[PDB]
Amino acid sequence: PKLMALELFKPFVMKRLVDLNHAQNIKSAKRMVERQRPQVWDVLEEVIAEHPVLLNRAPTLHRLGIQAFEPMLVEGKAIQLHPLVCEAFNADFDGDQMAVHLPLSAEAQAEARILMLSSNNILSPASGRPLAMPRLDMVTGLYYLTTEVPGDTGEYQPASGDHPETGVYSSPAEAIMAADRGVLSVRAKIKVRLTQLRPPVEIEAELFGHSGWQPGDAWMAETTLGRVMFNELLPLGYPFVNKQMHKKVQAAIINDLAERYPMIVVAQTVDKLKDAGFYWATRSGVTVSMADVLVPPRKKEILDHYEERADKVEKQFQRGALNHDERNEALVEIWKEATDEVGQALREHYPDDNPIITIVDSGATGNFTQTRTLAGMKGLVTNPKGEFIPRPVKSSFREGLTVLEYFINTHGARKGLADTALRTADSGYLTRRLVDVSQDVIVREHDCQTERGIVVELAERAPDGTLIRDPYIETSAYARTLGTDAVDEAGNVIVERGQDLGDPEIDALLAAGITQVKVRSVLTCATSTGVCATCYGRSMATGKLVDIGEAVGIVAAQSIGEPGTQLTMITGGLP
Amino acid sequence: NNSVPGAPNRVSFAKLREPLEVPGL
Amino acid sequence: ISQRPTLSEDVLTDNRSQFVIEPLEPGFGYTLGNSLRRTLLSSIPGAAVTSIRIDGVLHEFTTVPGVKEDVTEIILNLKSLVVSSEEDEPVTMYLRKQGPGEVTAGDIVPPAGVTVHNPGMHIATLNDKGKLEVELVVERGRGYVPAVQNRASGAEIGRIPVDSIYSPVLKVTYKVDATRVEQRTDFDKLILDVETKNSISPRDALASAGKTLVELFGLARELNVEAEGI
Amino acid sequence: SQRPTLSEDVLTDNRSQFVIEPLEPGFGYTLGNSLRRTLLSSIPGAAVTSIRIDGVLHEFTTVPGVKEDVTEIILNLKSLVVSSEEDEPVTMYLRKQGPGEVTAGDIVPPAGVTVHNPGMHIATLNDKGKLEVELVVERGRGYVPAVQNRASGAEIGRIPVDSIYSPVLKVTYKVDATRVEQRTDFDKLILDVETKNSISPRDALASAGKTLVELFGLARELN
Amino acid sequence: LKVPHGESGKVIGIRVFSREDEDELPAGVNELVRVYVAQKRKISDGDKLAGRHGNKGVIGKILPVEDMPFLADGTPVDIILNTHGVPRRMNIGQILETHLGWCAHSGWKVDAAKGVPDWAARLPDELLEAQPNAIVSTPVFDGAQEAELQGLLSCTLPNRDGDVLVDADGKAMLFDGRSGEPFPYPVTVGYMYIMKLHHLVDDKIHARSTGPYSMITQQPLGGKAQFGGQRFGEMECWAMQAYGAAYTLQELLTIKSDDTVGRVKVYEAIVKGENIPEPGIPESFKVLLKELQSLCLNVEVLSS
Amino acid sequence: GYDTPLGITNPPIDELLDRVSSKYALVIYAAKRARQINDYYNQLGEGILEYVGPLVEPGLQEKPLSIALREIHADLLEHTEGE
Amino acid sequence: LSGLTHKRRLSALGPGGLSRERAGLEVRDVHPSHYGRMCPIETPEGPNIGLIGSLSVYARVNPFGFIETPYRKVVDGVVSDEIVYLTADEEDRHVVAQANSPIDADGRFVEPRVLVRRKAGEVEYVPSSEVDYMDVSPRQMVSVATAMIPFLEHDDANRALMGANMQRQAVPLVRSEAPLVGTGMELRAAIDAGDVVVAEESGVIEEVSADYITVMHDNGTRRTYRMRKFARSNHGTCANQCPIVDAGDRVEAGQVIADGPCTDDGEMALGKNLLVAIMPWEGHNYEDAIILSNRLVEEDVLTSIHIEEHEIDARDTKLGAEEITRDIPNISDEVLADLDER
Amino acid sequence: FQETTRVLTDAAINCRSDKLNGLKENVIIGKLIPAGTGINRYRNIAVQPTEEARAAAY
Ligand SMILES: [Mg+2]
Ligand SMILES: [Zn+2]
């Protein structure tokens, strides 16, 4: 807000203004700034051209909780922010407040402009994978844009006798114009003729015989206009992607881009993708209404049958052979089975057009259990003692509960609130202690030239299969520096000694069939103080080898302590 | 059944009758 | 109220352009952008091909004998050809070749008036002892019209209507950016982007679109007499 | 085949319908939206700017004899609609004493201004008190916060009031498309506008048309 | 006494208590006077709003009236709510409340010439005929059922133009204010009760560049009223260390919090065009020294 | 081989790292030059031209640090390592 | 509403009670004996969860201090109009029916099997004869704040609690409007709130004014009520009263005469009615954000009034006594141009 | 960290002179932290335009 920036840049504005001869001295300039004459706004705009500022959501938790954004004047009394950085602060746009600092000296300016800049911290420190990605809403828009539907308007058709084959467009411009006119749905099967998009390797190696695609080479594609419009956002040279964009596919694409292209290109494409997703989310036609939450058609018969079996076991208990515990076990298992059956029926009922199904299946948010509760059955609910009450609720929120059911249900919410209240403090204390223990770890030497390297099983070879990827290769040996070259069975070397590992190199190793690999590790660093840079291996936020002098202890402490919030119950939780 | 003399009239989805007015809050 | 005049800047490229209008009153950004884009895209008159003929083929399921390319590929190649015409009535055009070799747009004999602005464009290639005769008609129009709107057209042997493009511009895009002319700091900055064919320059297309839009709003203005700012 | 458009008027008591056709396909919506956008915010008008109540120093108080305090009467006066012919701040008077009711028709406007809705109810007075209020009428367009008069540094007896210069109330459009395969593929625009009676719809439409013509004239010049 | 930092408005009244007039006052006082300042606040950006179903929010942006989507009859909406937050939070009640509010506002008239529809059997006989801007009340645990809403939404009175806006399901066709073209799919609309929370934005916003300094701690005051700077937690120090940023931390700890001569010199240098001089010794360290030297512990410096 | 960026991110970071050994050295390697540029501007009125002014022609009232970063990208400066 | 809730609050901490750390976590959970006495929904969100409840709508304290709850006793399967009040011990020792269970107009149980609450956490159908007690109304366990949330039977416990807590934080506007949809416990909760005046005896109003009213009793005694206008509230908001009566009307006893803050014709009104739309719009409503039309801003639909308060005092000192004076050393005339002679 | 009196006494008896090593003590004092841009390897850098630039600067 201008009312804040003007009062925050007062000395610089006064200096530049007295330089421009809008005042005579410093006191007069200060007085005029206080009075806020219309001669100050221009200087204020001129003096913050490339002056970075520091934001800090309170309480900061991890490294990415303090960014450095370029300021921009805007009316109001609220500090605007970028949608994709809210996850870094774990902020929710519902009354959260963050401070704003400002470096003064020319040294702090460069520091915050090079190191603390936001665009250079896409990759989270916990793992070498990007965090700032389409998160909540734009993902739905991308899913709608890339979704395919059969039998739409203007789809591709084959030559039917005396009629030509319709559904072929010379270039994306003609397809866009046709869609604008109203004769081509945005998501339909088409055969467009792209000219500035490298085809997939399967078609690149065949159509051009591996001669190499270059801009200006045409090839007849078979896809939908939405997919082409989405791919146009990706950086040039990237192979065409022609699959529906589930959240997992989005994550894979973003990770590949981060692992194959520089950070700046990744940030630019992410911004463009976010803009496109926001534009196309509104027109996805996602709303909520009574006709959207549809009741199951034959729930009554299933409920009656299960209640009849419940009555059967009730009579069995009335005979007196069984005790209370057996009755409770029978009731709980019967009602769990009934809830599962009702959920299956409800899933089988809904089509692929309801907004709830579209939101949940696209990975945008939520799970199927919430939909079942909202439309099917809430089922048995927890008790203050933690054991399931023998009395299950037989209605959903849509139909309407009763007084007894709500009274029984309140316990779960109360207990969850208490659990969160204790967990926050537990995680905070654990993080504080972990930060305390390891304060003085710093990379001093470039290389300890040591030989002891911990051996980790990269991928096991099945007795019947040829090779099975280890389910934890992503963590153990993904960024560590290769201690010794993993020469294949023959004399050829696939990965040379010292070369850091990575996604392409991991894939190459998997291709070579190597199973056991010795990797250089920091646990056996030979450095007298701290740990040599080579042992540590590829950095997380930088994407390359760590630079001398960089603190690692603080980074490790923050990374290990951040996930403490979700740690809950020999206990298995945070304790 | 507006106990107070001149309260605004707003018909309700009444199905059951309460046999006693709310006591002095 | 005079307020402040709005000047149209300009940027230049090979054949693209980024016209910029700055500053505008708050809210007029889209009010201009959307209508201007629509006018540019579907107002400027132009010429293009509507239908073709191939005596060497009876229908579209098969491909013309003695030619590497397919009928659909030929249609696509011939659709992108840029043709400028100055005669209202639909005139014909013939392409003929014999023997092995290639075919270029420049080799098509043009009648009076009509011209082709890209002679080096490729269409297809012929093998040895190959031949193909085509009789394509050219018509002038505006905007885009699909072949479905030209389905019912007399009775012929191999009439194959093709989706025409009656416009010299084919792509337009625009945004809006905030600007600070005063403490308001909300004025919009339109950023237009156009990419026309070889038959017109972006700036002349934009001038024609502005001409057409001003002529259209002349009806609204003429109903009475009243003035406003610059 | 190709004809310039034409605009005609279908009249009603106070809200008029305008029909424009033939327009090229996929073009009626944008034109209608542009006209609506330029109609609802850029039509010049006039409205009360600041009032002056005798015997009252500010707005958070009352005055003996009335049934509602100063804030309520300010809110009621906001509904007043006036048209200004002169381009300078003019002054009106409102003197009503004794029991009864005070309406919009009790104001004595000077030359060059008028009040078109004398039926509005401002307040009511008990016999004990009287009332004399002086108000200003300036000409502007759009909407301005009341605080504009705060910085003028006038005396105590001045009370700022929010100004809302807009005679248009509601606008809507529907397109009647004709998507036959014939070259008669066009659309017919049906624009409806209603005004606060300060100015007839024709005047507002002409003003909007002139504004858009002057705005688009900057592109027709050869670049 | 002067107005604090971030207050304005009229002066509505002044109360003065005098001991001469035989007015009880606290012991040791003669004249206590209090002044009331009243300010009218218009809802702006950064303000909280929330319905009766516990759905908070903030005013992201206040678009012009000419930009909001409008019904087919030209009635622009007043507020737009997100949809992804409804099913996850599982507060479907607000949708029913909005539908019922729209039904009551538009007025309904259930057909009865052929007889009461089966779904209208339990409706009160006086609730079958409503008027525009009618008032309805649904007691908790006993209210209109889903069938009641389904029936009512199918008999709403038409607009004065003669056409009905919403469909039976409750959705309607809108028109984009920017593009000007209708949305491909219908959207839900209706009247929902909206309150206003007390967490305004004017109280929260605050800035501080240079101002009064504490005399006992040599640190800037705290709080918006006192015009003091913000706190700088230790977690921020940890974060700064994590990035490896050193000079920034040095400034934050020395040149902008404690060092008096440092503050004066840096302020003067900024006022002029000279470079900022390097910070000095923070007052905290010197105080710690002069205090630890009091326990006979000779704390040398060893500059060598 | 990418769209030209806008704002403070020009020039990019990866290009600069190709010159400097590490990102931690670059910040000082540019801040010292910015300090020299500011000193030269201060003495512009009169003094010795020992702190040669900007090498690359500056823009319209650009911060000295931006000039330093934009000229370092041009490979026009030489520096000694730690002591 | 906030004042009423505070007056009805049930604290559990403080002097003579357990502390936060020593108090067990289990006490913060519900108990099957809370039905009808303490609302399970309304509760502070902060760490003081479960230690601060609220009386039920029909709850009354017995002369000893044990909360009671009304009930009508079924003698032989026929409902009894007469009602009695039972405490916890007596309630446990009897059979309590369900209010929502259908009952014939003659008092005959249409269903042979009716659900029932038993000693503790036990519910089971029983013949329609042994049943002894029946509840009065379905709303017998909700609090005062929670009792005015429409469609409360469809939301979630946490969401309902959040809405109930939010309802106690509204801000009085300038022009209030009664809700279009709301429970029937709005006017009653406003009359008992005390912030609205009411006539004692059925009289006829002679004259009314913005500052005071004069009603003539039927016995010939004139009475006058003074209404405070623009007086700072205890929390910084404003409070006013606007009579809603006309001159020459025979106002009956018990009829509201003036509407206080958050009121419209003698009924609570904490907000306005806005036309809502549910759709993601260009991400401006992303993650709980909201978009508002400028019509609200330019029409004072949600305009509020806040009154600050400052005070200064001149207390004697050993060095002398301070005195307020218009003059002040070394100050320009313009700075003190607002101060008066005193 | 803990037991300030005992450790203080023990250090004073031995006259334990400790260099400003590590972060916590170096931040308590206020001197530049010996990490990141604080290590002497980078704090002492001399940068001047290359001679080629000066020859061709004008
Ligand atoms: Mg929050
Ligand atoms: Zn090592």
Author numbering:
A (entry chain D): 444 to 1012, 1024 to 1029
B (entry chain C): 29 to 53
C (entry chain B): 3 to 232
D (entry chain A): 4 to 226
E (entry chain C): 837 to 1140
F (entry chain E): 28 to 110
G (entry chain C): 446 to 787
H (entry chain D): 1226 to 1283
Show me the paper's own sentences about this structure:
In bacteria, transcription is carried out by the RNA polymerase (RNAP) core (E) composed of five subunits (α_2_ββ’ω). To initiate transcription, the core associates with the promoter-specific initiation factor σ (the σ subunit) to form the RNAP holoenzyme (Eσ). Most Mtb genes are transcribed by RNAP harboring the principal σ^A^ subunit and the principal-like σ^B^ subunit that belong to group I and group II, respectively, and share almost identical promoter binding regions.
Analysis of the *C*_1_-map showed that the RNAP-oligomer was formed by eight Eσ^B^ units assembled into an octamer that exhibited a pseudo dihedral *(D_4_)* symmetry. The Eσ^B^ octamer structure was formed by two stacked rings, related by 2-fold symmetry. Each ring was made of four Eσ^B^ units, related by 4-fold symmetry, in “head-to-tail” orientation ([Fig fig1]). The “head” included the RNAP pincers, formed by β and β’ subunits ([Fig fig1], in cyan and pink respectively), and the “tail” comprised two α subunits (**[Fig fig1],** in orange/yellow). The β clamp contacts were formed by the Actinobacteria-specific insertion in the β’ subunit (β’i1, aa 141-230) and invariant residues of the β’ Zn^2+^ binding domain (β’ZBD, aa 60-81). Thus we concluded that the σ2/β’ clamp junction between rings forms a rigid scaffold to hold the whole complex together.
